[PDB]
RNA sequence: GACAAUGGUAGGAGAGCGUUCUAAGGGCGUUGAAGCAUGAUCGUAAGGACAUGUGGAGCGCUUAGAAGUGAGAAUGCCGGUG
RNA sequence: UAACUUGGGAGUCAGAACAUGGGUGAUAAGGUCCGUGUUCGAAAGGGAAACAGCCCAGACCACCAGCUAAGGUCCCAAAAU
RNA sequence: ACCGAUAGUGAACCAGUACCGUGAGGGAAAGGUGAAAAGCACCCCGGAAGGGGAGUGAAAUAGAACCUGAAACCGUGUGCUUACAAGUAGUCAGAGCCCGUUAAUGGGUGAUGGCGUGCCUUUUGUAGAAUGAACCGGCGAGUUACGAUUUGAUGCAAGGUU
């Protein structure tokens, strides 16, 4: 028997048009143009998920370095001392300590300076 | 019961259809390769 | 008064009466949990050392065990007919630090 | 998640003044670019400008090493066919002293919308006095 | 309370009419009849007959005094175009569009 | 010379910014009471009488 | 539950979703079916529900069967509109 | 941890650079034709300012965790003025 | 286990007819109000056309250009935002402002900071200045009959089968 294609192509074309809303001009109205930008956004999100871990780890290192220059020391001499002292506190926690509690960062610096 | 029928397990299969999408593995070229005499409609050379 | 605990491969700074989200736990919803590894205690209390301070455990009650919002993993190669789409919902566990 | 970001509300900018009497051009411009950018404090927040205002007095008496007073030429074009101008380093210090220092610092800042608002916090003067006495700029020793 | 009046199958092209409707929009009922009468566009006598009948509905059917009526909404929509042919050189033939618009005037009392 | 590219709705609506007309510049005649153009006669009952 | 494996074109192999029709069974509907529109919903994907508007008489579900069974492009064809 | 044998279905017969052993050319060519490896082809990621073929290294998915490779640590721009 | 108005005969329709060629000849487009015309008496603006009410009907945004009424496209209002800025127009991070959901690690807008030269064909190699696409909708390409061979399944077995 004959099988007229109906209501099945409009349904899957409307999902892609809705996935691209807020775009500029014909990028949110026409189907052939929005389909390509939907595919480009999927490839962009996969690359930016693995790059979000890169640019945040470097953001903490600067804030730690700025807090170390106040005590006559650099970042390279601070993480070497925390190892010989057996501290094992990551960058994310050292960044939130110096911002909130200034007294706590002096105790970690004195222990790391005594380890030489 | 005609409302509960089951064929013998392992006796029936679904045919293959080439040229229907790309995820099937038999899309554009439809299992023929690139240009040549064995890619045009009408077969190729006789084995004789 | 805060503390730094290692729970799911990472480290979190906790406080009394706080809603935190961590990796999946084997405990049931409504029960209690206890973090044994504490790395740093400070704030109002006296400063302590490291890697792990003696005792000073943290107790917390379980609130909910659910899944996050769904994402769509789509990649493709141009001029090469090869694309693949996946989906993902990562489970999590919510706790409330009642005592530090 | 658990990281602190500084918005427009909690930002405090200070005024500093630097003395350029007996210092190298490139060695001085690099440390001033750090003060303008805001990398001196723990609340960096890259997408927001947290730098401080800086003032450089005594723009003259900027020292060069080697044959730089003569062998360093500054080029610029004017979008006209054949129109190209050249000024040596020694002559720029004599006519427009502040321009020699102001361009060496602006060449180290990023060229963005935010990197242009940061370069507007610099005030360079050839003399030994600054007009901005209303504020209270504190002296700063370069390290 | 409102009063509408629509003119359909108006032979004048739509975007030629929208240039004049952007002048009476928001004005009073007295200031709009004068603006339309002292201008020399093609759609001037057409828009005036539509704005005049919209005031006749506001007094006969509805009960309100025309001393303080303002023009609330004015716009022009599309219509069924007419397809024509213009013979050109070397046997070619071009297309000519005899367009059509729908005029709509809405008056109100601001209450 | 033919257009190399299509025209946007943004670029088309920016060009027609100044494609407008102004008010005819009318005044009121204190003989016929109705509006009229300047330096012209009242088109209704009346005359110039300058 | 321990260990190991999971980048991929031409190509080989396996497992699934959806459209129309027939058979048997069992259901829904003028207290409003199909379709159309919107939504912050559920699945590993193809895809599946529900509520609210419009609509005015048909249509799902389970197990098998048979195919004019899936569209983004061929200076593709017809219609409409820039 | 693979090899050989029997049977079913294929695709491919336009290759490129780089290191090296050699013909031809003029110890010319991103030239051309052979031997032996690697990468691309069919390979994302980091480095060489941008740069299929060069150096490091082979992406099942998620994380605002840690340690290294080639290359790097005055500013742009993460780390020694 | 045939089609349901781009389908089925070229033709559901007054079609081998408009129309196109000196001629032999070639050839389309066009179905649907409602159960029943019960097809809007009368009033108002207007020269008319077309409208605003009142009536008919279960429904008139079912009024003969009459069932449902999609997209392209053309408009009328408003909540955020934009006139020193170098843009495959997205993505990740993120203030401020404005709303309140299929109730959950909420929705709309986006000051500013990172990273980023469309898709398909054909190629040793393409952002390519190599090819194709103005846009939207519909239609549009491994099939069936008869033979051969190799696999899975079922019946019987020195027999098996018309």
Q: Would you kindly provide a written description of the structure presented here, covering whatever features stand out?
A:
- The structure is cut from a larger assembly and holds chains A (about 120 residues), B (about 50 residues), C (about 100 residues), D (about 140 residues), E (about 110 residues) and F (about 50 residues).
- Chain C has about 100 residues and is mainly β.
- The relative contact order of chain C is 0.31.
- Chain C is built from no helices and nine strands.
- Chain C is about 0% helix and about 55% strand.
- A four-stranded antiparallel β-sheet of chain C has the order 3-9-6-4, with no helix packed on it. In chain C, strands 2-1-5 form a three-stranded antiparallel β-sheet, with no helix packed on it. A two-stranded antiparallel ribbon of chain C has the order 7-8.
- Chain D is an alpha/beta fold and about 140 residues long.
- Chain D is built from five helices and six strands.
- In chain D, the strands form two sheets. A four-stranded parallel β-sheet of chain D has the order 5-2-1-6, covered by helices on one side. Chain D has a two-stranded antiparallel sheet with strand order 3-4.
- Chain E has about 110 residues and is α+β, with helices and mostly antiparallel strands.
- Chain E has a single domain (about 1-110), classed as Ribosomal Protein L22, Chain A (Alpha-Beta Complex).
- Helix content of chain E is about 35%, strand content about 35%.
- In chain E, strands 1-5-2 form a three-stranded antiparallel β-sheet, covered by helices on one side. A two-stranded antiparallel sheet of chain E has the order 3-4.
- In chain E, strand 3 (about 80-85) and strand 4 (about 95-100) form a beta hairpin.
- By secondary structure, chain F is an alpha+beta fold.
- Chain F has one domain (about 1-50).
- Helix content of chain F is about 15%, strand content about 10%.
- Chain F is built from one helix and two strands.
- Chain F has one helix at about 10-15; strands at about 25-30, 35.
- Chain F is rod-shaped, with a radius of gyration of 21 Å.
- The chains are: A mainly alpha (about 120), B little secondary structure (about 50), C mainly beta (about 100), D alpha/beta (about 140), E alpha+beta (about 110), F alpha+beta (about 50).
- At the A-C interface, helix 2, helix 4 and helix 5 of A face strand 7 of C.
- Chain A binds three RNA strands through helix 1, helix 2 and helix 3.
What's the SSE blueprint?
This is part of a larger assembly, with chains A (116 residues), B (48 residues), C (100 residues), D (143 residues), E (111 residues) and F (50 residues).
Chain A: H1 9-19, H2 31-68, H3 75-84, H4 91-100, H5 102-114
Chain B: no helix or strand
Chain C: E1 3-6, E2 11-14, E3 19-22, E4 32-35, E5 38-41, E6 58-67, E7 71-77, E8 82-88, E9 91-99
Antiparallel strand pairs in C: 1-2, 1-5, 3-9, 4-6, 6-9, 7-8
Chain A binds three RNA strands through residues 1-13, 22-27, 29-33, 35-37, 39-41, 43-62, 65, 74-77, 88, 90-92.
PDB class: ribosome
Keywords: antibiotic, radezolid, oxazolidinone, ribosome
Entry title: Structure of the 50S subunit of the ribosome from Methicillin Resistant Staphylococcus aureus in complex with the antibiotic, radezolid
């Amino acid at each position: 028997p004959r099988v007229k294609g109906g209501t099945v192509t409009r349904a899957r074309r409307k999902k892609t048009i809705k996935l691209a809303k807020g775009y500029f001009g014909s990028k949110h109205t026409l189907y052939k143009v929005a389909k390509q930008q939907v595919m480009k956004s999927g490839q962009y999100a996969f690359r930016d998920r693995r790059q979000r871990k890169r640019d945040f780890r470097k953001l903490w290192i600067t804030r730690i370095n700025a807090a170390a220059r106040q005590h006559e020391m650099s970042y390279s001499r601070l993480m070497n001392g925390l190892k010989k002292a057996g501290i094992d506190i990551n960058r994310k926690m050292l960044s939130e300590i110096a911002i909130s509690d200034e007294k706590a960062f002096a105790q970690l610096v004195t222990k790391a300076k005594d380890a030489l | 019961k005609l409302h509960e029928l089951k064929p013998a397990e392992g006796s029936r299969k679904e045919r293959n259809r080439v040229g229907r999408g790309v995820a099937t593995g038999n899309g554009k070229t439809s299992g023929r390769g690139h240009k040549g005499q064995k890619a045009r409609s009408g077969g190729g050379v006789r084995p004789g | 008064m805060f503390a730094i605990i290692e729970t799911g491969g990472k480290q979190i700074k906790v406080e009394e009466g706080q809603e935190i989200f961590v990796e999946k736990l084997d405990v049931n919803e409504g029960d209690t949990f206890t973090f044994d590894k504490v790395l740093f205690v400070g704030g109002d209390s006296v400063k302590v050392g490291a890697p792990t301070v003696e005792g000073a455990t943290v107790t917390a009650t379980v609130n909910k065990q659910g899944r996050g919002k769904k994402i769509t993993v789509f990649t493709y190669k141009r001029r090469k007919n090869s694309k693949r789409k996946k989906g993902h919902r990562q489970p999590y566990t919510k706790l409330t630090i009642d005592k530090i | 998640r658990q990281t602190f970001m500084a918005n427009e509300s909690n930002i405090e900018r200070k005024w500093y003044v630097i003395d350029a009497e007996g210092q190298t051009l490139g060695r001085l411009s690099s440390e001033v670019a750090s003060i303008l950018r805001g990398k001196n404090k723990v609340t960096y927040t890259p997408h927001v400008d947290t730098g401080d205002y800086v003032i450089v007095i005594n723009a003259s008496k900027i020292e060069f090493t080697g044959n730089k007073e003569t062998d360093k030429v500054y080029y610029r074009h004017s979008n006209h066919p054949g129109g190209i101008k050249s000024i040596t380093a020694g002559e720029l210090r004599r006519t427009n002293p502040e321009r020699l220092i102001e361009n060496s610092i602006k060449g180290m800042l990023p060229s963005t919308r935010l990197g242009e608002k940061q370069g507007k916090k610099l005030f360079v003067y050839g003399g030994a006095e600054h007009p901005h006495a209303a504020q209270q700029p504190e002296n700063y020793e370069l390290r | 309370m409102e009063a509408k009046a629509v003119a359909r199958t108006i032979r004048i092209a739509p975007r030629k009419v929208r240039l004049v409707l952007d002048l009476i929009r928001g004005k009073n009922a007295a200031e709009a009849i004068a603006i339309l009468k002292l201008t020399n566009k093609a759609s001037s006598p057409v828009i005036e007959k539509v704005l005049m009948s919209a005031l006749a509905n506001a007094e006969h059917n509805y009960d309100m005094n025309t001393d303080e009526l303002v023009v609330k909404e004015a716009y022009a929509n599309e219509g069924p175009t007419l397809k024509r042919f213009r013979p050109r050189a070397q046997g070619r033939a071009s297309a000519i569009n005899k367009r059509t618009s729908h005029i709509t005037i809405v008056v109100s009392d601001a209450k | 010379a033919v257009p190399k590219r299509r025209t946007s709705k943004t670029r088309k609506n920016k060009r027609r910014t100044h494609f407008k007309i102004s008010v005819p510049g009318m005044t009121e005649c204190p003989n016929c009471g109705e509006y009229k153009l300047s330096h012209r006669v009242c088109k209704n009952c009346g005359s110039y009488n300058g």
